[PDB]
Amino acid sequence: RSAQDERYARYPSLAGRAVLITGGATGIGASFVEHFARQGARVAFVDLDEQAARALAARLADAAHEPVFVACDLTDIAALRGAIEAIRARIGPIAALVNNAANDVRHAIADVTPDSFDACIAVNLRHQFFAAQAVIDDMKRLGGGSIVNLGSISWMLKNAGYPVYASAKAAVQGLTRALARELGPFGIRVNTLVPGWVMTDKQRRLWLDDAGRAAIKAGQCIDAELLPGDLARMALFLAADDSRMITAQDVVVDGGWA
Amino acid sequence: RSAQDERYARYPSLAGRAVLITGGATGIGASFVEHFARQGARVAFVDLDEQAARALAARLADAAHEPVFVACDLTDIAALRGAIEAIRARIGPIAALVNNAANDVRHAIADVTPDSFDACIAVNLRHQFFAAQAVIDDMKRLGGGSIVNLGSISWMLKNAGYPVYASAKAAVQGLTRALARELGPFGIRVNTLVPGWVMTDKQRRLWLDDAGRAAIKAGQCIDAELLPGDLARMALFLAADDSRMITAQDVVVDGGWA
Ligand SMILES: NC(=O)C1=CN([C@@H]2O[C@H](COP(=O)(O)OP(=O)(O)OC[C@H]3O[C@@H](n4cnc5c(N)ncnc54)[C@H](O)[C@@H]3O)[C@@H](O)[C@H]2O)C=CC1
Numbered sequence: 431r432s433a434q435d436e437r438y439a440r441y442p443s444l445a446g447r448a449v450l451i452t453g454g455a456t457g458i459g460a461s462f463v464e465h466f467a468r469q470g471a472r473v474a475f476v477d478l479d480e481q482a483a484r485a486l487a488a489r490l491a492d493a494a495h496e497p498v499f500v501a502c503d504l505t506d507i508a509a510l511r512g513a514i515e516a517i518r519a520r521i522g523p524i525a526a527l528v529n530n531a532a533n534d535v536r537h538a539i540a541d542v543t544p545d546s547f548d549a550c551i552a553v554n555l556r557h558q559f560f561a562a563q564a565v566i567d568d569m570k571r572l573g574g575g576s577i578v579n580l581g582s583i584s585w586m587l588k589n590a591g592y593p594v595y596a597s598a599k600a601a602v603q604g605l606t607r608a609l610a611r612e613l614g615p616f617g618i619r620v621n622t623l624v625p626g627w628v629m630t631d632k633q634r635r636l637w638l639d640d641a642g643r644a645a646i647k648a649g650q651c652i653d654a655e656l657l658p659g660d661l662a663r664m665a666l667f668l669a670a671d672d673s674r675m676i677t678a679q680d681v682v683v684d685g686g687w688a
Numbered sequence: 689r690s691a692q693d694e695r696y697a698r699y700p701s702l703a704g705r706a707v708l709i710t711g712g713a714t715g716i717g718a719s720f721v722e723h724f725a726r727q728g729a730r731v732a733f734v735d736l737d738e739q740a741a742r743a744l745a746a747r748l749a750d751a752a753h754e755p756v757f758v759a760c761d762l763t764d765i766a767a768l769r770g771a772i773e774a775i776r777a778r779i780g781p782i783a784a785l786v787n788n789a790a791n792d793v794r795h796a797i798a799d800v801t802p803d804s805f806d807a808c809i810a811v812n813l814r815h816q817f818f819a820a821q822a823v824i825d826d827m828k829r830l831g832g833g834s835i836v837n838l839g840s841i842s843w844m845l846k847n848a849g850y851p852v853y854a855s856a857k858a859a860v861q862g863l864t865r866a867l868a869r870e871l872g873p874f875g876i877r878v879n880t881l882v883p884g885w886v887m888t889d890k891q892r893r894l895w896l897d898d899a900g901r902a903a904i905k906a907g908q909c910i911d912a913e914l915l916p917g918d919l920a921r922m923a924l925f926l927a928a929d930d931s932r933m934i935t936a937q938d939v940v941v942d943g944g945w946a
């Protein structure tokens with residue numbers, strides 16, 4: 431598996447490091463969970479998909495630390511805070527946070543309601559703020575930390591089909607930069623990690639067809655598949671000591687598309 | 689030494705890899721040489737500064753491969769190509785290129801002449817194109833490669849004091865993006881690596897005073913010194929297999945300033 435490929439880096443500073451990943455049960459989040467666990471980190475993740483989450487954690491029980499799973503709905507901030515506190519009691523103070531969960535469900539401009547606007551913000555942006563809010567004091571006490579906010583090239587390409595989603599993901603830029611200014615005095619880096627079109631299992635099974643492949647080939651500079659591992663490795667570097675002075679950045683891993 | 693600090697990553701794919709660095713005798717270039725040497729790469733570098741270059745190579749003579757040095761003035765394209773060919777004859781096809789050499793000497797708008805304009809472009813931009821031109825066939829034949837072009841945050845901050853330098857450094861964006869598009873079909877990544885104000889020896893002795901220290905602290909999000917190793921570790925990642933789908937980027941390592 432890509433997270434155990436011997437050609438790729440090993441990051442000694444991740445061993446035993448407490449790492450929290452949201453939306454970790456499937457897709458890129460699952461790749462984050464697997465990569466960090468195989469680096470020796472003490473992983474925990476939250477998600478609504480319990481069956482996928484339990485199977486992921488069981489796959490990774492031979493890691494140095496079996497990943498901790500707590501189920502919660504990230505649109506419920508009280509539940510999110512309760513889950514993080516429960517996680518802290520099991521893995522100790524949080525040293526790295528990957529704000530990954532999202533929902534890119536399509537919506538036409540004419541159909542958006544105030545409630546559906548709010549739901550999109552809640553699932554794509556709001557939880558990134560409150561997850562970070564809940565971990566700052568741990569990272570301050572540790573003498574530093576790393577927060578990785580998942581962005582998107584969707585709004586950079588000016589994709590139609592989901593204008594509130596594009597707004598929510600562009601908003602991550604402002605979130606990252608505002609947190610980076612305030613938290614940098616404490617050794618806390620905050621960065622936006624921006625994926626291109628990643629071939630998650632869901633994207634392969636539901637959305638990749640001939641026109642998709644042709645769009646990828648014309649857009650990307652490199653005619654190859656962007657994989658979850660390409661994003662996971664970048665997150666490892668951003669959470670490791672190796673990137674101590676990288677903060678407030680939009681770190682794009684997309685084959686040269688956007 | 690930062691390049692041998694056990695807390696940082698080891699990149700297995702760099703072992704034995706032929707890596708060429710321009711302006712590698714001092715400052716950040718020397719840190720590039722040192723880092724790639726300590727990762728086990730087969731390093732070669734060019735520079736005008738022969739005394740510093742021989743000392744740097746001799747000091748790294750206990751690495752897996754002693755870095756190869758060939759002297760040249762990179763503003764002379766024939767000398768640059770000949771130096772690269774001398775290097776190829778010793779370490780074989782080039783797998784990775786770090787285009788680092790530069791000269792940021794200050795100049796009043798009113799004092800620039802046609803010749804002084806051309807020399808600024810020659811030492812700051814032109815050699816990046818031609819060193820890239822001289823390694824592309826190697827990278828094609830190897831099935832891929834990585835070209836790292838050194839940019840600057842100076843033009844991003846709109847610094848006064850050296851307008852042709854600022855032009856040359858902004859020009860690296862177009863160079864990187866144009867090559868990335870043309871060379872991506874061959875598995876060649878091209879990225880701009882953008883340092884902040886890095887505390888090289890030359891920067892401390894010549895440019896860092898109380899004024900500079902105040903600007904750094906107000907500008908950077910993280911109130912700590914940016915060091916050459918911060919940039920070198922990013923270059924290691926960009927040249928290693930771990931960054932196979934990162935191309936056409938402006939990779940900024942600057943403590944959150946620009
Ligand atoms: N081609 C791609 O996959 C793209 C990825 N991104 C971003 O990368 C990150 C992950 O991408 P994907 O894996 O493709 O997303 P995905 O939709 O396939 O998976 C999201 C995961 O978060 C969980 N999730 C969704 N809503 C939740 C909620 N209220 N509460 C708890 N968990 C919830 C989900 O169960 C899921 O496991 C996202 O932030 C996405 O916006 C953006 C650019 C392209």
Ligand SMILES: NC(=O)C1=CN([C@@H]2O[C@H](COP(=O)(O)OP(=O)(O)OC[C@H]3O[C@@H](n4cnc5c(N)ncnc54)[C@H](O)[C@@H]3O)[C@@H](O)[C@H]2O)C=CC1
Binds near residue numbers: 712787888890
């Ligand atoms: N150190 C900093 O604060 C910043 C660095 N940069 C960029 O990072 C890269 C390295 O920066 P520094 O180490 O500070 O530069 P530097 O001026 O201290 O060293 C440049 C090295 O290249 C060699 N060099 C200069 N002209 C040459 C020529 N015709 N022929 C052969 N060799 C030549 C020099 O001998 C030197 O060893 C540069 O491309 C620079 O523009 C940009 C942002 C700030």
